[PDB]
Design a protein around this nucleic acid. Structure first.
Length: 109
RNA sequence: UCCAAGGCUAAAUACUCCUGACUGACCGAUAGUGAACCAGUACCGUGAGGGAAAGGCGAAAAGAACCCCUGUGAGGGGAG
């Protein structure tokens, strides 16, 4: 069976998190945790948090053997964007989008 | 045909800030008032003035006790 965890609302771009998600998609739980704990990217702490929560759900709610799990699916979607104003020169203003991301991870044997 | 250089005179006529009742081949949230919502507000302007956006869980809050991951965070998964 497939055990899910969701991390709706990470304060980071989905583009910046998809690079991290592409390197753990399909890996075993142990290898994925190694990649995430030694990544230099900020998206990896979010992905590691969501993955650890999914593994905890699989151990606790579903009673699965953690040693045989793997990151069966993972995808990052775009969340709600905060809109801000950045002043520029000559009295002009640009809109700034502070993007967020939703991280969905599904572990499975 | 009528008697200025004295004064008056209701009704039938005009209108709606409003009160009551009732109606609509009027609108239904970019519409209908600018304004269904804490709106002439926020915001802009020295000022006169200009002037927004923004409604809906469910029949009933019964609005998720408790457990788990997490930083007693967010967010989620079970349970209900």
């Amino acid at each position: 069976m497939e055990v899910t965890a969701k991390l709706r609302g990470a304060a980071i771009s989905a583009q910046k998190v998809r690079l991290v998600a592409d390197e753990v998609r399909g890996k075993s739980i142990e290898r994925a945790l190694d990649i995430l704990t030694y990544s230099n990217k900020k998206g990896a702490v979010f992905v590691k948090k969501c993955l650890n929560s999914a593994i905890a759900n699989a151990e606790h709610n579903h009673g699965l053997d953690i040693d045989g799990l793997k990151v069966a699916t993972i995808y990052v979607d775009e969340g709600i964007t905060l809109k801000r104003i950045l002043p520029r020169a000559k009295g002009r203003a640009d809109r700034i989008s502070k993007r967020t991301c939703h991280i969905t991870i599904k572990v499975g044997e």
